[PDB]
Amino acid sequence: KPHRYRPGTVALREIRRYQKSTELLIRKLPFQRLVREIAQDFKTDLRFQSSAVMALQEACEAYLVGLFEDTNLCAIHAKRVTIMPKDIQLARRIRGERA
Amino acid sequence: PGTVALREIRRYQKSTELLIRKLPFQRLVREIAQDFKTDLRFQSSAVMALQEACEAYLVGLFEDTNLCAIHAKRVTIMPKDIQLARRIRGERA
Amino acid sequence: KRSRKESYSIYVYKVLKQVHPDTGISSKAMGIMNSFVNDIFERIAGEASRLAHYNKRSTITSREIQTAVRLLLPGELAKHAVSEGTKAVTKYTSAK
Amino acid sequence: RSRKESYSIYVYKVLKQVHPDTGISSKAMGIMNSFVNDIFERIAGEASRLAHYNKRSTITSREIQTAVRLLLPGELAKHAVSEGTKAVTKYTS
Amino acid sequence: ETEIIEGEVVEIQIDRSKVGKLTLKTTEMETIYDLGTKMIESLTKDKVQAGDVITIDKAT
Amino acid sequence: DNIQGITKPAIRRLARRGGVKRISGLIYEETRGVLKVFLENVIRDAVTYTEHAKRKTVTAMDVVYALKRQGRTLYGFGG
Amino acid sequence: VLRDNIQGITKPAIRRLARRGGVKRISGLIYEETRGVLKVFLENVIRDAVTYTEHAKRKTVTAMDVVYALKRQGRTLYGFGG
Amino acid sequence: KAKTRSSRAGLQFPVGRVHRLLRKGNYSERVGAGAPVYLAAVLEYLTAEILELAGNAARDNKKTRIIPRHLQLAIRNDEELNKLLGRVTIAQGGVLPNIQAVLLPK
Amino acid sequence: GKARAKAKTRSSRAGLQFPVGRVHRLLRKGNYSERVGAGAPVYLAAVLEYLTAEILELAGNAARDNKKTRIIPRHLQLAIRNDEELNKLLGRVTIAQGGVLPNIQAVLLPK
Amino acid sequence: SIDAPPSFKPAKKYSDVSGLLANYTDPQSKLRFSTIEEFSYIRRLPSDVVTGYLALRKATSI
């Protein structure tokens, strides 16, 4: 009875909604805890500036967005619309990271 | 068939020479450089370095193109793969 | 009293008011423009340092930055920058 | 004439410490020259930039050690750090 | 009473008197050892490679 | 354990900015690896810069210098 | 005959380069496309190599010029000087 | 009366500050007289070119204040500026809206 | 004024082989900073020694298996590309007349 | 000519954490211990105390 949307239109709705705004996605506290634990794993008793961690967050988000764009190109190249890890491996290798 | 090609594949991956004839490459380089300025002179080592760098670039390009072609469950490489490799590497779009 | 901070805030703002009289600018854009000017200046300066070593020189010349700026920039942009810089130097040498 | 200069007679002199009965071709000598002065320029530039960042006037042993730590990827970094520390310790005494 | 050195050997290095060094490893500790000239012969006579559980009488 | 702090909807949002319609369910566990590795390099530099200045606080300029040495330049943080 | 020298890069040469790259099959539309790519690369090196020749007030392009041009594009070349 | 060299050459960016930074920047031991002038002219040209496009984008967004979004749009839309600033990321600037053709519905 | 005749070089005092004096001169003339420290050229020479020793050891090991008594660019190429650390240190470099490592993908192999 | 000459007698080895007669070593840290609990303790220790012990009785590590 309730009106249900087709699988796929909500996808493009979210694409258009997120490709216009420029807010931070990952929750701030988990990212801060992650970077803190990584730093302590390297060097204990460290202090972080808030601007520094937000710049790390923005760099990571930009990296992930570019990676997913390349992954999308790889997936479309294989006559598909769903992204699987092999696309990410191919992109990462051609860019020249992994291998 | 399909095995004489692999013979070449194995042969060329061992030998280390220039796979492009020198005279046409020299003519190409001279004609390309003509537009920037007329009446130029070229050091021979400059031409050799140009040809070496271009061959290395092409080899890397074809390596990535082969990876692209394998990704799509194919064996033949088509321009659809070279364009993708150039796009995702970063020389275009 | 603590030290004094250095930026390019007033000059870019003046250029903006010169090109768009009624358009303002935010603080984050101020920082981004500062970083952009710093990066571009460092690029042209550091790239100019190497030509002196390459050609066995000691002085940075105006005719050398002219060559440095036409390597970092694409065609039309480099041509226009070269023309405007040449005009600036020509107007500067007429008064000294 | 000209002191073209080079490390040709140095890397070759190093060779005897690892392979006392091995020769070097001229092209390999040029390759090693380019490799060594490339690494020299990389390390020197990194140390310079770091010293300028820390608003200092002198590039010292610790600045170049940090440059090596930044530039050398893995176990090469720590092994080269140990080698350099040993060399400087023997130089001082 | 007797002194016994029993354990698994990890790596052996003999230079060219002679200088030797080997690292023994049990399940609960590891230890490096510098060899005298006699031990050089005692280890070269009986070819000892990596991953060998060996027992040595110190007095002999 | 904090890598799980990068929840699944966050990965979905990051993917949605990129312009992808459908996400596999096993992508996340591999994607969290990439976030795990790319972040393990800048910190390598970020702490190291911090350790050169005899100080033990990671300022906002060390991360900028690290990202510049790696080839990714960012603006707005005193670059 | 009045023919452009880009066609001087013969088809067997491109096949040899591809086989060195490790490819089994070659479609027929690569042959015209690759030459085009080979143009673009030479349009981003010689242009630089001439500029250095400008800055030294010289008329002969030397190997050091092309090595420096390749160096700035993250494609450093070894064994040809520098 | 002391007149700044920028005013004498008809520029906006400081010739003196650029010359001081060149001298103190270890790029060379000797700095020419016209080098700071020419560098400041180039920097002013680039700043004007970027800013005018950013202001046009802000006007298209029907707002009178330039934010990082307008700068990102101005850089990415222009081919030459994007080529110059290819490897740089603008903080909180996002990415242009783009949908692949094959991903549109029917 | 009297001075020592045939004084010892700084390289020999440091136990290295690369010229510490030449490295110091290059550092001073390269305009990396206005003042150059004392122990910096020694440390740089030591690092260069380590790198050259490692790469030459690997090149000689590679050439020995090819039944050749002389190092050629091919042996250097084989040496660098077969070690991950040196490969990632020299990722964006081209060795002239060095060829390419021979590798075939599993898919393209017959049967 | 008032300083003592170098000793010709070999110097004993002592545990760096308990001051007892050592009989082993440790390739990972280049220290010396005496028993199993000493080995567990020295493995549980961070690099700071290890380098402090090495620099105390000066060694090839600075």
Q: CATH number for the domain including C31?
A: 1.10.20.10
List, in sequence order, every residue forming a beta bridge with G60; answer none if it has no partner. B41
How do the residues of chain J divide into helix, strand and coil, expressed in percent and rounded to 5? 30, 5, 65
**For B71, what's the count of Cα atoms within 13 Å in the CB-facing half-sphere?**
31
- Tell me the CATH number at A37: 1.10.20.10
- Alpha-carbon span I90 to D72, nearest angstrom: 11
C-alpha torsion sign, points I78, I84, I87, I91: positive
Q: Is J29 helix (H, G, I), strand (E, B) or coil?
A: coil
- Alpha-carbon span A69 to I81, nearest angstrom: 30
Q: Is D58 helix (H, G, I), strand (E, B) or coil?
A: strand
Q: Is residue B70 part of a domain?
A: yes
Token code pair at residue G36: 């085009």
Please say whether the structural domain H1-104 has been given the CATH code 1.10.357.10: no
- Of the residues F11, F13, F16, F51, the best mutation for testing chain A's interface (the one with the most A CB atoms within 10 Å of its CB) is F16
- Tell me the CATH number at F66: 1.10.20.10
Whether E8 contacts E44, CB under 8 Å: no
Nearest beta carbon to residue G50 from set B36, B52, B66 = B36
∠ CA E14-E16-E20, rounded to 5°:
25
- Alpha-carbon span D87 to E17, nearest angstrom: 27
∠ CA A24-A27-A30, rounded to 5°:
135
Identify the residue whose tokens are 């979905």. Answer: F12
For residue J5, the 8-state DSSP code is P
Whether A15 contacts H94, CB under 8 Å: no
Tell me the residue type at J35.
Answer: T
- What residue in J sits closest to E10 (Cα-Cα)? J27
Question: In chain D, what residues touch I28 (CB-CB under 8 Å)?
Answer: none
- Alpha-carbon span G42 to G32, nearest angstrom: 16
Q: How many CB atoms lie within 10 A of CB H98?
A: 11
Number of domains chain D is built from: 1
Token code pair at residue G75: 């494609």
- How close, in Å, is residue B88 to chain G by CA atoms? 15
- Alpha-carbon span A20 to A68, nearest angstrom: 17
Identify the residue whose tokens are 């898919």. Answer: I107
Q: How many CB atoms lie within 10 A of CB C60?
A: 26
Q: How far is CA I38 from CA B2, G64, I47, J19, in A?
A: 65, 32, 16, 40
Q: Which of G36, G42, G34 is nearest to G12 (CA)?
A: G34
List, in sequence order, every residue forming a beta bridge with E52; answer none if it has no partner. E9
- Alpha-carbon span C15 to C8, nearest angstrom: 11
- How close, in Å, is residue H72 to chain I by CA atoms? 30
Q: How far is CA F2 from CA A33, F5, F34, in A?
A: 7, 5, 15
Instruction: Give me the helix-helix angle, D8-18 and D26-53, nearest 10°.
Output: 100
Alpha helices in chain H (DSSP H): 5-9, 15-24, 34-60, 68-77, 79-84
What resolution in angstroms, rounded to 1 decimal? 3.2
- How close, in Å, is residue C6 to chain G by CA atoms? 31
Q: Which of I76, I30, I90, I52 is nearest to D72 (CA)?
A: I90
Q: Is residue B53 part of a domain?
A: yes
Tell me the residue type at A27.
Answer: R
Expt. technique: cryo-EM
Token code pair at residue J57: 């009785």
Query: Which structural domain range is residue A86 located in?
Result: 15-98
Query: Which structural domain range is residue G43 located in?
Result: 1-82
- Of the residues B57, B62, B65, B71, the best mutation for testing chain A's interface (the one with the most A CB atoms within 10 Å of its CB) is B71
Strand ranges (DSSP E) for chain D? 23-24, 58-59
Q: Is E20 helix (H, G, I), strand (E, B) or coil?
A: strand
- How do strand H65-66 and strand E4-14 relate by DSSP bridges? unpaired
| Neighbouring subunits of C (3+ Cβ pairs under 8 A) | F, G, H
What CATH number does domain I3-109 carry, 1.10.20.10, 3.40.50.1820, 3.30.465.10, 3.40.366.10? 1.10.20.10
Q: How far is CA F58 from CA A18, A75, C54, F61, in A?
A: 31, 39, 38, 8
Cβ contacts from D onto G, under 8 A? 16
Cβ contacts from A onto H, under 8 A? 35
- Report which secondary-structure segment, H or E, holds D8: helix D8-18
Q: How far is CA C41 from CA A11, C51, C82, in A?
A: 43, 16, 15
Question: In chain F, what residues touch D46 (CB-CB under 8 Å)?
Answer: 69
- Alpha-carbon span B40 to B44, nearest angstrom: 13
- Number of residues that make up chain C: 96
Q: Longest Cα pair distance anywhere in chain I, in angstroms?
A: 85
Whether D71 contacts D43, CB under 8 Å: yes
- Alpha-carbon span G75 to I92, nearest angstrom: 6
| Neighbouring subunits of F (3+ Cβ pairs under 8 A) | A, C, D, H
C-alpha torsion sign, points C18, C24, C30, C32: negative
- Report which secondary-structure segment, H or E, holds E14: strand E4-14
Inter-chain residue contact G78 with D37, CB threshold 8 Å = no
Q: How far is CA G28 from CA B8, B67, B85, G14, H56, in A?
A: 19, 19, 18, 12, 47
Inter-chain residue contact C55 with G54, CB threshold 8 Å = no
